[PDB]
A paper describes a structure:
The 14-3-3 family of eukaryotic proteins are abundant, medium sized proteins (~30 kDa subunit mass) endowed with a well-characterized phosphopeptide-binding ability. The human 14-3-3 family comprises 7 isoforms (β, σ, ζ, γ, τ, ε, η), that form all-helical W-shaped homo- and heterodimers. More specifically, 14-3-3 s bind protein partners that have phosphorylated serine and/or threonine residues presented in a specific molecular context. To aid structure determination, we have developed a streamlined approach based on chimeric 14-3-3 proteins fused to the sequences of interacting peptides.
Unexpectedly, structural data obtained for the pCH3 chimera were significantly different. Most crystals produced poor diffraction, with the best 3.9 Å resolution data set collected from a crystal with two trans-interacting dimers in the ASU. The electron density maps of two neighboring subunits belonging to two different 14-3-3 dimers were clear enough to trace the C-terminal portion and the following peptide and to conclude that it binds in the AG of the adjacent subunit. Although the distance between the C-terminal tryptophan of the 14-3-3 core and the positively charged residues typically coordinating the phosphoserine, was too short to allow canonical phosphopeptide binding, binding of a phosphorylated residue was still observed. Surprisingly, in both cross-patching peptides, we found that it was the second Ser residue of the linker (-GSGpS-) that was phosphorylated and bound in the adjacent subunits’ AG. In one of the chains, we could trace three residues beyond this pSer, LRR, indicating that the bound peptide had a completely reversed orientation to those observed for pCH1, pCH2 and other known 14-3-3/phosphopeptide structures. This clearly exemplified the extremely rare case when a peptide phosphorylated by PKA at a non-canonical position (N-..pSXXR..-C instead of N-..RXXpS..-C) was then erroneously accommodated in the AG of 14-3-3 but in the non-standard, opposite orientation. Interestingly, in the pCH3 structure, both 14-3-3 dimers adopted a significantly more open overall conformation than in the pCH1 or pCH2 cases. Surprisingly, in the pCH3 structure, the open conformation of the 14-3-3σ subunit did not prevent binding of either the sulfate ion or a phosphorylated peptide (yellow).
Numbering used by the authors:
A (entry chain A): 1 to 74, 78 to 235
B (entry chain C): 2 to 72, 76 to 231
Write the structure that this text describes.
Amino acid sequence: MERASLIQKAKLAEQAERYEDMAAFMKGAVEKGEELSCEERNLLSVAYKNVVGGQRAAWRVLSSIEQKSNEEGSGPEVREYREKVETELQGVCDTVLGLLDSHLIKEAGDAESRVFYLKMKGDYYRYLAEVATGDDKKRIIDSARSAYQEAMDISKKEMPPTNPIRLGLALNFSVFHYEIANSPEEAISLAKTTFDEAMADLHTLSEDSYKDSTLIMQLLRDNLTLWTGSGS
Amino acid sequence: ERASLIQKAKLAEQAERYEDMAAFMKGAVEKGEELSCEERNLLSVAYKNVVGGQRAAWRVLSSIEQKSNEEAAGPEVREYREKVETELQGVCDTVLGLLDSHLIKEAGDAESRVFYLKMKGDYYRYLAEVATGDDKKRIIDSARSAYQEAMDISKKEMPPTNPIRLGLALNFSVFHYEIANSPEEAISLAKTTFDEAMADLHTLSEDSYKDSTLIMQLLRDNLTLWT
């Protein structure tokens, strides 16, 4: 089907490293109104993650230049171009959130995929929050907070504390608390709690999941080590 | 203004947004001012990166299209390889379009005129790596007549150790071996360019010593690979 061609082409774009095209093919495939398989969700995620990743990296470089020029010692061209990048980035996030709302979230049946999409919804509102400045910041921060909270409530009632999707979601929500909401204590606390609960349930894991789950637990410990300790 | 476009192209280079860098350089060229040394290099980088990425992707796809013949396959591969091919053609046409009105006709000195006439030969050569039909011959010839006019405002204007003149000869020899499939002419041109620059090494200054020997390295590499 039209859908089978779009999926095949998205795989070719991944191999050709044409992520903008990969995103477009996955968008079109979603729009066929079929549920995404596990492999397909990951193709969708990779496409948009790469696209937004590049825009965020560039925005940081430009924002950094804009700030080092307003400092003691050292034209409006920097602001104009930083705004262009910002606007482009917003377009991508709005597109992603538009797809999750109409129609990935409301269209998913089982709990695993419902959590995956809500986590993605928090992730993309969090990306919008990284750049937002006005009265709009607060609303956006809150829409990311509810997407993550709704995903957390489902994962607690439907998944074991060692499930990698659950661990991934908690890890991102804690990063959101530290960096976005600027609630470092809540971030540290959520991270430790998630770790210790998964830790108590390690013995119940099968061989293949233990690798995936300990890898995410490594990321939680890394953040905890960073958030609780200096240098010098 | 032109000053803003130039400044923005520099920012895009730092943000690695080459598509945007190309667009800013195009706009700045269109002001009708001559490009300084720094500016020509921003223009060459901006389009080289863009086209480089498209060529690399086309090769990957063309390779997959050939490995599927024997024998999911489907027409999807061809459909997408054609999309990439078409996109690439648009870029080359844009480059050559301003390398015509105006860049080589707008330049006064010989170094600058050679730079643009090398670039024109380079972008026609790119159009060939994709073209196959009755069109493959015309394009090869437009790259050829561009490289020969460039090969003559070089031997008669620049020393045999000049890096621009070495760079141009290196590319024209690659055009003979790979595109025109005249391996003998390629080998001959390469060896000649090498040995003439070799005789004049002692006359080089400290800073040019590095740049010129580097090009001569790519010419002793090619000649120990091709033969």
